[PDB]
Amino acid sequence: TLRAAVFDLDGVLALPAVFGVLGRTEEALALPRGLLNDAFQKGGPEGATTRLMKGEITLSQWIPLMEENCRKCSETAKVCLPSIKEIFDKAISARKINRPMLQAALMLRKKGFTTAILTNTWLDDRAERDGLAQLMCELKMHFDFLIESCQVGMVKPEPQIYKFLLDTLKASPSEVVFLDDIGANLKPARDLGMVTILVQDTDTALKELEKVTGIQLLNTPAPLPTSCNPSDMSHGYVTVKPRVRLHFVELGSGPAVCLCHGFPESWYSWRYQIPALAQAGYRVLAMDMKGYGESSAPPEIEEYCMEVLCKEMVTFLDKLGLSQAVFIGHDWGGMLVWYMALFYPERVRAVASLNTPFIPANPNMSPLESIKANPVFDYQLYFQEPGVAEAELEQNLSRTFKSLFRASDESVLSMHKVCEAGGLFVNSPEEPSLSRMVTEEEIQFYVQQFKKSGFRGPLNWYRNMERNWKWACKSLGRKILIPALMVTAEKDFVLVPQMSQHMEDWIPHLKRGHIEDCGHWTQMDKPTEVNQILIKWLDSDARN
Amino acid sequence: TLRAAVFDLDGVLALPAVFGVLGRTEEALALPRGLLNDAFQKGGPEGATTRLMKGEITLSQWIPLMEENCRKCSETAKVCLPSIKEIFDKAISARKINRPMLQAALMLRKKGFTTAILTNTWLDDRAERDGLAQLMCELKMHFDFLIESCQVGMVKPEPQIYKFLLDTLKASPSEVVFLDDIGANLKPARDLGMVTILVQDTDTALKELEKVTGIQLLNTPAPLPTSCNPSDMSHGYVTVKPRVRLHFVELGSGPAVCLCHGFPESWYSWRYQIPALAQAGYRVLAMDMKGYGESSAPPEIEEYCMEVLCKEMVTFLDKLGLSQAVFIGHDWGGMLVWYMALFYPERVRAVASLNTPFIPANPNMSPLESIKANPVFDYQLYFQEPGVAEAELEQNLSRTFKSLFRASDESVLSMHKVCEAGGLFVNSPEEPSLSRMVTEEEIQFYVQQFKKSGFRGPLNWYRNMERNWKWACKSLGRKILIPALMVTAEKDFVLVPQMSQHMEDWIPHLKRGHIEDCGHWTQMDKPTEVNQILIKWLDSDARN
């Protein structure tokens, strides 16, 4: 019975095979067939290529040796040579991840398999090495082990590397599927009793793989974007003032992108966006907003007014030494980011909001008058009195998050007449069913985060209506003229798409995105669609 | 008696004044004198410029209004106009920090003064706003307060802004020196009883300033590069494996630069380099190396061999989502970075070492034979036996750090015959004098860091001689062909400059730096010189 799957890199997890460039170069340069491939393997076990693959020498040292081998071969075949570096730079550059092969490895691992990459590779010291470094980073994170010939000083098809593989997997050979594009490198695994698959075209190899494992790997749905394992992330902490520290998770390099969650959420609400945005070439900073998770939660209502929250986010940038960040918010975080754009445009590279529209303050109406008007905002009046909503939300955390985090068709709450009914969960189940958007483990993460500070700080975001209104009136003569994106969600019944209809009057150059069949919890409801919209916008309007 | 100093931005802390571009543009475009300056102030208290300075409108909204004002003025003066945006983009871009003025503010603050910037400024939403954002960030960090007209909705010369200034300073007017380049903006401070200085040329203003404060500000020495306040930094934590977490301090944006300290140090040993490198356009990651400070310190000797330390630094990069970093090391950190370059060139953008040379393993001699040969390395044999050096170094932490951290002429230790004498501090004072390189507060920081784990993990770096030798022999056929810098220190009597004499044989393209009258503690001994060498090298060989 199988419990381990091993994949080669070149011609299996990454295509086209860098091997398959010597053949194409021969064809393109009208050189004798197999001339370059024979120069590459010249000397066999003691040749320059084996020394490279075992880590004895680096790629830049190997280039001149491959060059002499090519001359020696052209002399014997009685032919004239017309740059090995250019050939290899182009071949490595063209090699991209084989997405259906990676998808199969991901599924096997999701089903309990131990997965590994076993590869004959080199120590790359070329000026262009970063490309390969990026490829290896993207791939390796999805596997339990990465065994590289140049690091272990052993090469396929030597028998020692297969014994080393079995030792690292902690598995007997019959428990292992081994996939390779080189039949000779497949032979020692077969001899040991491993299931072996010779990879030519991906589809056929995956058919052989699903047949031998009994798991559907081809024609399969989805899947969801890569998520975050909280214990595997870099966690950052900045003191913005004596009693206030902000926590964030950080991933990637490039322009800084600050993600700001809503109520009652976490940095973890961006779990599907963090790996995608970092892979797209951005430095992601996913915040625990003030009052949440590992960030400080002072009890005072006034600590949560927009003017202080924005001032603190500017201090956060100052302490990290960032002159700007792109700010992307959702829900309350979306309101924060529009106010960052209005009050601190010099610090905001670009602004995006999910669901939350930009609506200016009405100087002729109190915020309470504006709230009472729309029946959907009744729960907000319930949130005003300190202690009342805290008690209901804190009473059973698992129930709170399971009742809240639901898709549009899983509706368990009716936010109209919340005050009259006397609560959010008054006619809601004690033991709600788990939404299709979340796992039990994901709910328990929110439960654990909320055990530290509870709901006082988060609910305080709603208790500064008058204060926020007075501050926002100072901006009534301004327009938002920095790059901006508004993303509406068709089925968010609180932050309806129509509420954004007048935004062009204040943000003339506004760009838009729209997600169909998407409820309030945008990032987890439609993560693939969110990622597509944000990456497209960042690349065109934000930079690097 | 003075205790507060207030500086204007334009024409005081930053030069040339953006104001002084309308005059130069008039001259360059043969327009009537004062035409642009009158269009800029048109309407006075209710004109477009006052609305801009109070934060009513943004800079991009003000541009077309200044444009109409210029047309109205050209019509009246009966002249023909030949782009306001281009004029202002160029003026803001040319404006740089007035270094002697900033130096004076730094000295006043070092002497106990409360310092502030009070400025008439705008909300900058131009595509080029980052330049100004960068300038404000650099300046603001050196002051207690930054009061901007567009954020407070008040403008100089209105009396309210001066009362607001006094309220924020918590000072009576006679306790305040106010420096400005506009006499009209100086008038209300004088009327209130503040000492006022009209700034034309810097030198004269500083002469007036030192006369009124009684502090030497002109012709003064140094000073030292900006240092780090540990509580003001962003602190990051990454779990590299179950029982090992690495702590780092992070500052800046740009290419990642990983700083690796030596024995027995801290991330804080790079305090003078962190702000300088971040200001130069780099993302600095200053590590607490394994065994130190807030990083994990497992007791096992083998946890500190170079192969595992390097593997962990690669995992650190993987978890932060960094395909590469430039690695800069000192002492033991310098040995680590050369091995990162040899074993993981794809992950190393460039490598630099302070003091520590790259010397290959001798396959014909045991590391203990090589150590016993050089009398200066005798203390290393003393470090071998677990517990012995730990007890001596842990007995009195203040004494340990005060005895170690000394300039070349302050020599209190003699590392020859350490074993024979029976310790590092056997003929060293119990209460050493404080070196001129460090403050008492800086020593207490190291003392506090070492209270957590002690010296077991740090000394374990020396207890893997055989293990490190076997691993290093695997690299004997390689060369370091990625960008590399070797910085020698003239007066380091352990890591002597001559020990680096053969490095070109292994690193043919090696670049060098050399610091005269510099001992072992390079970063704190000669911080200005270290910064100059590293920034010059990073900008030419590392990138952004």
Ligand SMILES: c1cc(-c2cc(NCC3CCCCC3)n[nH]2)ccn1
């Ligand atoms: C104004 C109101 C809001 C807002 C969002 C929100 N979300 C929390 C709510 C979502 C649906 C279930 C009940 C809790 N409540 N108020 C956000 C930004 N500006």
Ligand SMILES: c1cc(-c2cc(NCC3CCCCC3)n[nH]2)ccn1
């Ligand atoms: C080999 C030895 C060393 C080395 C540095 C060092 N520094 C600690 C030492 C400095 C002078 C005072 C006594 C402690 N000891 N051994 C560093 C890198 N490779």
